[PDB]
Amino acid sequence: SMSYTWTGALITPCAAEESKLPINALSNSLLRHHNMVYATTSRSAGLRQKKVTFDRLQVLDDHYRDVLKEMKAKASTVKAKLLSVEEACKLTPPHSAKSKFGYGAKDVRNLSSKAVNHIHSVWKDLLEDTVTPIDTTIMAKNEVFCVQPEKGGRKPARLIVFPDLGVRVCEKMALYDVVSTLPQVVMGSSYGFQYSPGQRVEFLVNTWKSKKNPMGFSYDTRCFDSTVTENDIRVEESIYQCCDLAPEARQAIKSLTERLYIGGPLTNSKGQNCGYRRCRASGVLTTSCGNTLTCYLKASAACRAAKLQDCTMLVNGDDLVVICESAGTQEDAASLRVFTEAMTRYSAPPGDPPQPEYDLELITSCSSNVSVAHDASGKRVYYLTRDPTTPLARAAWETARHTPVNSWLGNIIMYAPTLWARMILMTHFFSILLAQEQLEKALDCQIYGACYSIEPLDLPQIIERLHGLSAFSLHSYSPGEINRVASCLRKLGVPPLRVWRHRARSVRARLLSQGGRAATCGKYLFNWAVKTKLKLTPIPAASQLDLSGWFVAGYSGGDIYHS
Numbered sequence: 001s002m003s004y005t006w007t008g009a010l011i012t013p014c015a016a017e018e019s020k021l022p023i024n025a026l027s028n029s030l031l032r033h034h035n036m037v038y039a040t041t042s043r044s045a046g047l048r049q050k051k052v053t054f055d056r057l058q059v060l061d062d063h064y065r066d067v068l069k070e071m072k073a074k075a076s077t078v079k080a081k082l083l084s085v086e087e088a089c090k091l092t093p094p095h096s097a098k099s100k101f102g103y104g105a106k107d108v109r110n111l112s113s114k115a116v117n118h119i120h121s122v123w124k125d126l127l128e129d130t131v132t133p134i135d136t137t138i139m140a141k142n143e144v145f146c147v148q149p150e151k152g153g154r155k156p157a158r159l160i161v162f163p164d165l166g167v168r169v170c171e172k173m174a175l176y177d178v179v180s181t182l183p184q185v186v187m188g189s190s191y192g193f194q195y196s197p198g199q200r201v202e203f204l205v206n207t208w209k210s211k212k213n214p215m216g217f218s219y220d221t222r223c224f225d226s227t228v229t230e231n232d233i234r235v236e237e238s239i240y241q242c243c244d245l246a247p248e249a250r251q252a253i254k255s256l257t258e259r260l261y262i263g264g265p266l267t268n269s270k271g272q273n274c275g276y277r278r279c280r281a282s283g284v285l286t287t288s289c290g291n292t293l294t295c296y297l298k299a300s301a302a303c304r305a306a307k308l309q310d311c312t313m314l315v316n317g318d319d320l321v322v323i324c325e326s327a328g329t330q331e332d333a334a335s336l337r338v339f340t341e342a343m344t345r346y347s348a349p350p351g352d353p354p355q356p357e358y359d360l361e362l363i364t365s366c367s368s369n370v371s372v373a374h375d376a377s378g379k380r381v382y383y384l385t386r387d388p389t390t391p392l393a394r395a396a397w398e399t400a401r402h403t404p405v406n407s408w409l410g411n412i413i414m415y416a417p418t419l420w421a422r423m424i425l426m427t428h429f430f431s432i433l434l435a436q437e438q439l440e441k442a443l444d445c446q447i448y449g450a451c452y453s454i455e456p457l458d459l460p461q462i463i464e465r466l467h468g469l470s471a472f473s474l475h476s477y478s479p480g481e482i483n484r485v486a487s488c489l490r491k492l493g494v495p496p497l498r499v500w501r502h503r504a505r506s507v508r509a510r511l512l513s514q515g516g517r518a519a520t521c522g523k524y525l526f527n528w529a530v531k532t533k534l535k536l537t538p539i540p541a542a543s544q545l546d547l548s549g550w551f552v553a554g555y556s557g558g559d560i561y562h563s
């Protein structure tokens with residue numbers, strides 16, 4: 001069973017692709033070593049194709065079937081509803097790719113006769129036909145990274161595979177409720193997407209402390225989407241079908257599974273046949289839910305095979321971390337080899353070889369790790385951080401280019417308590433917003449794969465709600481964290497933190513002069529900058545903002561808009 005077969009036709013871009021970091025008058029203030037930042041293009045698609053194309057062997061034992069039975073029993077308690085055409089239409093992003101059948105995303109959102117009637121026709125076809133493969137478009141992703149020597153230096157572009165807009169709206173009708181509600185029921189506390197950043201830290205810290213002698217490890221599956229087999233996708237559907245569903249929903253789900261999710265023909269941007277997929281499509285509604293379930297199933301069974309004691313898992317898509325009871329250094333090493341052997345048999349072999357870790361702060365999961373700082377009272381506060389290299393490289397790109405998704409805003413929200421987000425990201429971008437008088441302008445960014453329109457003036461309310469008032473007063477960061485940030489700044493040629501402190505005093509003063517919500521941004525987001533701090537009190541506007549739906553489920557690749 002080959003993950004892909006290829007015709008020879010190239011993966012083509014839809015427009016001009018930039019690989020070199022764009023530079024304007026503002027670039028140098030953030031980053032000096034411009035040659036270190038690059039974007040992935042279709043020119044490296046061939047290299048990705050070779051990496052993602054392989055034979056999958058699967059050997060399924062009693063542990064696997066045992067866990068599946070338990071998952072199905074939980075799934076059987078879920079009652080899910082079909083979305084109406086209108087409800088599905090409103091979940092479509094305004095700038096989502098247009099249909100090849102004579103309408104765009106804005107037509108869908110406006111409930112135009114042409115769009116709605118076509119969607120009805122696609123739905124009718126799904127109910128009637130459960131065999132005919134549905135067309136997909138294959139594209140190379142344009143993503144910004146910093147060069148990383150020993151990784152081959154530069155990573156090839158990721159492959160995105162997605163069906164037509166009409167099909168995407170139909171996916172929503174059939175499965176939006178399922179993928180939003182089922183994962184937490186089946187996986188419980190192990191489902192990562194139910195957690196805000198602070199809630200994730202809470203879960204990780206509490207889990208670590210619950211063990212007598214804790215040991216943890218992240219498990220990196222090599223090219224997870226390609227490891228997903230027809231079996232896996234059919235198993236996922238069987239889980240979905242355990243739900244209390246309308247007969248209509250059951251038919252649509254069965255059809256989508258057979259015709260889209262299991263595999264299908266690949267078409268480039270020019271309309272040429274590129275080949276065939278027999279693995280996970282990155283750009284469907286069930287991608288996040290399917291991957292989390294599949295990873296959870298394989299990992300749970302692998303934990304049993306390895307006889308891991310008092311196991312606790314945390315799963316987000318392909319991203320897996322396990323915390324358990326240590327049996328000793330040699331014993332743990334042996335246990336992880338058995339775990340890896342089990343995962344490999346299930347068709348989930350490792351990329352990075354898994355290693356036991358006895359320091360929670362050194363465990364990276366969802367590209368992030370738990371670190372410790374101190375609040376204004378001097379009390380230890382745990383928070384989520386990461387290596388700032390990619391965030392800052394993407395911030396550099398967004399400084400000189402308008403982008404659909406503003407990664408900097410998402411990074412400020414999710415990493416608000418961090419040294420680097422506060423000192424660099426907040427300072428840099430609020431200065432930009434002040435200069436253009438664009439503080440009031442709402443910006444698009446993605447949280448857990450879903451698109452949100454967010455006003456930067458709401459940041460103090462957002463940060464207070466998610467991270468607490470402590471996020472505005474954190475100090476005395478860990479030596480490891482300080483060292484990592486320092487290494488990043490040297491690498492990228494970012495001005496030292498002392499320069500950022502000086503700049504922040506100016507940014508703060510400007511914001512305070514503006515009045516209104518801008519003054520609140522100055523007071524709260526930049527209280528770290530001044531030597532004599534203010535009191536900091538709860539914001540009345542914070543409880544008014546609707547933050548439900550932010551941390552319920554993952555929707556990466558699912559074409560989801562929540563506003």
Ligand SMILES: CC(C)CCN1C(=O)C([C@@H]2Nc3ccc(OCC(N)=O)cc3S(=O)(=O)N2)C(=O)c2ccccc21
Nearest residue numbers: 197287288291316317318319366410414448449554556
């Ligand atoms: C864990 C989280 C609190 C911190 C890291 N983080 C994240 O993990 C995500 C995120 N997580 C995640 C993990 C795994 C994942 O796998 C999807 C797959 N199909 O394998 C997809 C996602 S996401 O939903 O695309 N986004 C994210 O969107 C994000 C955005 C801004 C800032 C931080 C983010």
